[PDB]
Structure formats: structure tokens, C-alpha cells
Amino acid sequence: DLNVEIVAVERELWSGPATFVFTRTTAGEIGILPRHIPLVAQLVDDAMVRVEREGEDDLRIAVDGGFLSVTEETVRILVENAQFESEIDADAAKEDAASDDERTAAWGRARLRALGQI
Amino acid sequence: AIHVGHHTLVFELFGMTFNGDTILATAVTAVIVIALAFYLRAKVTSTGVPSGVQLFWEALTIQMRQQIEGSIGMKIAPFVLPLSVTIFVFILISNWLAVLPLQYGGADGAAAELYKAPASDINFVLALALFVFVCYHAAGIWRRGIVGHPIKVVKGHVAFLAPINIVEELAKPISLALRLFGNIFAGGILVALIAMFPWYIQWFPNAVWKTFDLFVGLIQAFIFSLLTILYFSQSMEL
């Protein structure tokens, strides 16, 4: 298996084993499996991370300022900010989406994608 | 000899020839499709657990609806769904019915098939392709007028290539037909070729080719329906 570490600037948010790490880099959607080759990529502005763990429900994380680093022994996602699916509130995400401010619009779109409404 | 292009049960009517074999094959395929349709209609289960036939029809309808919605709104082209699903099921049944062991010897060493895939006849593919062609051009006319649609198709997305454009507007039907016919015609020949071998060695290549031809027919039906949907979407826009 592969160990995933979702780390924020202020603190390390999440850390644990997983089975499939989906995300959307600038080039395009990427799915990391246990022995993926080493890689460094930049997550898109409104990126989203989906961690499929062993014997557990998937974890959806909205990511802001994301960066992905695969090392064949652990996947490390460095995020300026992030929010788990449970913590994300729908109404605020809708309000902040489709905003002129590019940063808040990207954050809102990432929250929408993490929730499931896309 | 291969006896390519020969037709059995050929008759005449109203000063016109009619290859009986292809008519019979089309009739049998239509009977099969109608039987499946009425089996579904009798055994529709909106609330309770669905049947296998209901599952098959549901899967096909969902696939066609998804393709249409991706290409053009279902609210804009509802009939395209029945057209695509009927085309798909017709072609698939016609191609798959050839898998049955209906091939024998014609008493002169030339293989003869009791049932031959109707798509192997130019008339069948011509009918399907021309019907789809007329249908989608009429849909375009309805969507964007009687003179608007010809102008749009002639100019296309870029006006300066209007001459070239016309060519594909004539290639769309032909490419739709010949491809299908061609892909089936090969089968109608391949098995015949395999029929030259002695049985004790002829069985193996025939089995392999027919097994692959199952997938080939599935792919051909899917491609025909999908390209019909896409042509409908292209005709009906703006």
C-alpha cells in the first residue's frame, strides 16, 4: 500500500495508508497507485483529492494551492489550505463560487467538487 | 470458386428485382427484435426487480441517452434516442445471428449459408444510411429553417472551406453505409474461405473467426448508432 500525507502550511492535516489517490493536476487527472513512479506536479487552482483507503469510505478533500509529490513510498500533497468533505458547508461554497475574485471562485469550485455537486 | 454476390430466392415484382435471402434475413431479425420488445412490454417492472430483457433494454436506452445528452440536449432531439436504439439493436441482432451454424455444402464444394447477414448486401446498408441521412438533414432543416440549414452545412464552422465541407456532407452517408457493409462483407467471405479446409482442420479457424466476428458486429452496431447520434447533433445546433 501507499501512505498519503495531506499537509497544510500551518499544520499536517491528514496522514494514513490508502489504496488509490485521484487528483487533477495542471496536465490533467492523475491516479496514483501503490508503486507509481516518482513525480512532482502542481494541482489545479480548484483541485480536489480523492483518497480510496483500505476497508474505509473514500475521503474527498478540497485543496487550495495544491502540489503533489509521489515518491513510491508515500504520496505527499502540500496544500496552502484544505477542507474535508464533512467540514465543507454547501451554502458558503455556492455563495463564494462564480465570484469575480479568481482565488475565491477557485476555492468555491474546489469545495463544490469535493462535496459531490461538481 | 466463392460465388460472391450470389443471391438465393431472388424474385421479381413491379419490374424490380428482389434478393429473397436478404429480405428473409431482415424479416427474421425484425421478428427477433419485435419478440424482445414485446417480451419487455409484457414484463415491464417499474417497481419490482427487473428481468434480464428489461436490464438489456435499460442499459441500451441509458447508453444512448447519455450519448445524446453529451452531444445535444435530449429536450432538443428526443426522437434521436429511439432512432439510435433501434439502429443499434437491428444491426447487432443481424450481425450476431450469423454466428449460428447455418452453413453447409452446396453439393459442388461451395459453401452456402441458410442465413446470411443482411448487412452483407449493399441494399440493407444503403437503406439504413440513407434513412439516417434524410432524417438528420430534415432535423437540421426543422431546427434552422429551410434555407438556413443548407447555408449552415455549406459554410460549416469555417466559411472559406465551403467547397471541401460539401464533400463530407456527401461522405457521411456513404461512409456510414460502406463501412458497415464492408466490415460484414469480409465475414461473408472469410467463413467461405475457411470452408475450403477439411472439416477436421476447418473447424478451428472458423471458430476463431466467428468468435472475433461477434465482437466485430457489436463494435459495428455501436459505431453506427454513435455516429448517427453525432451527425444528428451536428445537424441540429444554433
Binding site: - | 460472391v4 454476390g5 415484382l13 413491379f14 424490380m16 428485382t17 428482389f18 434478393n19 436478404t22 429480405i23 431482415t26 424479416a27 425484425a30 427484435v33 419485435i34 420488445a37 414485446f38 419487455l40 412490454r41 415491464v44 417492472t45 417499474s46 427487473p50 428489461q54 433494454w57 435499460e58 436506452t61 441509458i62 441517452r65 426522437f79 434516442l81 429511439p82 432512432l83 436504439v85 433501434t86 439493436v89 437491428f90 443482411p118 448486401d121 449493399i122 441494399n123 440493407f124 444503403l126 437503406a127 439504413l128 440513407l130 434513412f131
Partner: protein, 38 residues
């Protein structure tokens, strides 16, 4: 020759047409209703 069309064309079309009719009446509408209800 084999590429030249024949009368069968019309006949084939006719058969296809009726099939489409059935597919447009007793297959697609019930299935769409079932999917919408689900």
C-alpha cells in the same frame, strides 16, 4: 455484380421502419418512464 442496389432497398427500409415504430412506441417510452420513476 453485387454493389448495384435492387428493389430490396425499399423493402428493407419498410421493414426497418416498422421496427422503429415499435421501438418508438412500446420500448423507448416505457423504459424512459421506468428510468424516470427510478
Amino acid at each position: 455484380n453485387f454493389l448495384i442496389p435492387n428493389g430490396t432497398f425499399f423493402a428493407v427500409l419498410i421493414i426497418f421502419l416498422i421496427v422503429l415504430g415499435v421501438i418508438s412506441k412500446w420500448v423507448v417510452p416505457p423504459i424512459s418512464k421506468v428510468l424516470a420513476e427510478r
